[PDB]
Structure 1
């Protein structure tokens, strides 16, 4: 429990919506778990009308990858800011204690890197996000956030202490975007990141997003990119929102056990239709599929989901169960 004397392990991160391989309950003692992330500023196409965002990311994606450790472990992150970027960046882990979540110890200009270590002494899903002095909201709404999941060493439990397991974990980052429009009513397109700043701050101040998207763009988690599962399988759905409130809902399903405030030492609530993720936090829900078909997983402000983008799909294979639901009479002429 002096970290300098514990065993170290290096973890290879994977892009959302997947989550790197990890153990739930573990017999291992505490470890220093080492991760590396490289910041990439890049222009991204965020809708099907050609709208672009002068975006800023951890590891090339929105959200950044999910990092998974166990309660008692130490997180050790090397943060790299290449010389091909234009702005300075840093990282604030909501799961850490002190120095503005680590931000004060990780201020890196383009061409620099830094390494931070902190004790992950609290279980739960926590946001991590960039927070450079003087430009915090701009870096966060441009894409710089992701989740740290700290699992209890004994794995997740229900309100009575019974063991809960998941077969697969998915991570969904929800981003309220503020794209400026010009006097012709079209969204603006900037040559550089610094040029989008002033216009973007004015839109931010109205508190009305132009778009609200899951994982970087409208329909990101649809079509070939839909989430997948099978009847009988239990999924863990991690949902982060670093700037604004959201209310997740699984259409045709439920939140079997949900930690909406995302902290695993608290008992979960069961049978939720819709849950609430406070801006500045990550929460987690378990669901075991009982019916096959296409589900929608969305923010249940329905204008925010269908008009502004905050909706994805989960394609589930398996056998239909008529005891749970059955069409008694299909659509047909009204008896006259």
Structure 2
């Protein structure tokens, strides 16, 4: 796109504030930002806030979100679809023109680990170019295993294709498949979907800890066979809903847009790979590392 030539918009922080016991304001941008998705490979991503996947959003069950999108793209319209919410897509997930803002309000009444993404036609194009992310809705009564958990992180799986190439998007295999981590607490890493960062700077944990991961596979196109090497998932909550409880799963099947909360114990010091077990995808980037130390 001629109007994207030379465009690299610096990342903008997510803006979020609570405005009542059950109401939260969220402000995001749609912007065009160079991301190093593999060593030496820059993708001029269509993004929320200059991150792909986008910034993490965390709300409580029963929060109404008053969402603003500021569209910094000089020429492409953008929008927002939160899977967490009940909304009219044709009224509430509508386009915001270049250099304009739009505000939309809707309730998140279901707990879980939900995909968000741009909903501008063609949606495949907007997702594949990078406009995806996760919103976590925390359950009013927790998870039955909350007391057992020592440490938590968020991981997101996505693919990258040939740049802005709709033929490849629809008919081609992914060039890269990648994990990223998004921060829940201060000092947690916050990364983009790339083939290397979580190998070179592993997630950290202590020997003996029960780890919770909030996970979502945003696609756009592939399913994920989520697995942590050297452990077994003690508990799995499909879509992060507490009712959808499985136990003792080696591998969690995630549809495209599918999420889960998974919990597992790391019993011994070492580095534990985290993979999609569809190994072609793993080979093309989708391996993260968890480094487990005696401290």
TM-score, normalised to structure 2, is 0.82
How far did residue 43 of structure 1 move? 2.6
Q: Deviations over 1:243-294 (max 9, x none)?
A: 22111110111222112x3141423211111111110222221223222211
Aligned residues: 267
Residue equivalent to 2:286: 310
With over 3 angstroms needed to count, the CA separation of the structure-2 counterparts of 1:41 and 1:229, relative to structure 1, is: same
Deviations 1:279-320 (A, max 9, x none): 0222221223222211101100122102x111110111128x
Of 114, 120, 130, the residue aligned with 1:143 is 130
Aligned position for 1:62: 52
In structure 2, the residue matched to 1:209 is 174
**Residue 205 (structure 2) aligned to one of 209, 229, 240:** 229
Aligned equivalents of 2:257, 2:125: Cα separation in 1: 14
TM score, norm. by length of structure 1:
0.73
Q: Distance in 2 between matches of 1:75 and 1:232?
A: 38
Q: Aligned partners of 1:263 and 1:100: how far apart in 2?
A: 23
**Cα offsets for 1:1-53 (capped at 9, x unmatched):** xxxxxxxxxxx859xxxxx9xxxxxxxx94202222122212322212x2232
Whether the 8 Å contact between 2:215 and 2:261 is mirrored in structure 1 is yes
Partners in 2 of 1:256 and 1:85 — Cα distance?
48
132, 138, 144: which one aligns with 1:157: 144
Larger radius of gyration: 1
Give the Cα separation in 2 of the matches to 1:165 and 1:155.
12
In 2, the alpha carbon distance for the partners of 1:222 and 1:171 equals 15
Conserved 8 A contact 2:63-2:108: yes
Q: Does 1:276 align with 2:253?
A: yes
Matched, 1:256 2:234: yes
Structure-2 residue corresponding to 1:129: 117
Shift of residue 55, structure 1, vs aligned partner: 1.0
Residue number in structure 2 paired with 1:113: 101
Structure 1 unpaired stretches of 5+: 1-11, 15-19, 21-28, 180-195, 320-336
